């Protein structure tokens, strides 16, 4: 139960990181209810990558009552639009507003470059790496 | 802070999923404590899968204490091993005990065939629409 606790909105943004060429669209989540955030990789910045990775956010945060965005077409298509409204989310896209994932984008990209240094990448990361570099530098973030 | 709650100890298996082929065999983790599912797809059981699957599991409950599974091969090989000490976490297959993931397995195979058939796959569901399916039941099972 909410209670008086905070609204369930998120902020969603996608962010390009080289380091995880060829999939170095990263599309991030940041709960502004708890500041958990989720990212996901993806090949081109497209409506379908937006929906793929909310489907995925809501799999790990629950389903939000609404998703302030800013006005990139990947998120006012009618696509992406008919996807919010199949599952019942508020969209947003404020007013003619979301420092929360502006931080959770520079702190992942931050992470994701300590930790590739770390492991002794200095540039693009092996393709074989990403997936599990990327889940610990969520970990790292959220946990 | 847990407190007096629950310890953080995870069970994990694969359970094998043709209507997600040909990434069919499914990973699962059930949280103990909280009873929150963890599921990816994988086209073999491996080893590198489980530790794949773990990397995601860890990046959405967090790092547990302890994992419970079977004797497969995947997670008793040196790398699986190997790869649990390199995070800190407690591995066991019992004594020579996992009915929560079981269940998980029962409950997750017969959501995907509910969400699949009202998408109106019978059969297979096509490659494109498995990962927005598979986390829906997640987020069914989840949230």
Redesign the interface.
């Known amino acids: 139960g909410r209670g008086l606790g905070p609204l369930q909105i998120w902020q969603t943004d996608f962010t390009l990181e080289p380091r995880m060429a060829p999939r170095s669209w990263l599309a991030v989540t940041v709960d502004t209810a708890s500041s958990a955030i989720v990212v996901t990789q993806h090949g081109r910045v497209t409506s379908v990558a937006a929906?793929?990775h909310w489907?995925?956010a809501?799999?790990?945060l629950?389903?939000p009552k609404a998703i302030k965005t800013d006005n990139g077409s990947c998120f006012t298509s009618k696509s992406t639009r008919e996807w919010l409204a199949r599952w019942g989310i508020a969209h947003t896209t404020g007013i003619p507003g979301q420092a929360m994932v502006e931080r959770a984008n520079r702190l992942l990209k931050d992470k994701i470059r300590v930790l590739a240094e770390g492991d002794g990448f200095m540039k693009r990361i092996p393709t074989s790496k990403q997936?599990?570099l990327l889940?610990?530098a969520?970990?790292a973030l959220?946990?």
Request: a positive charge; charged letters at 20%.
């Open positions: 929906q793929h489907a995925t809501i799999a790990v629950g389903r997936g599990e889940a610990k969520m970990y959220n946990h």
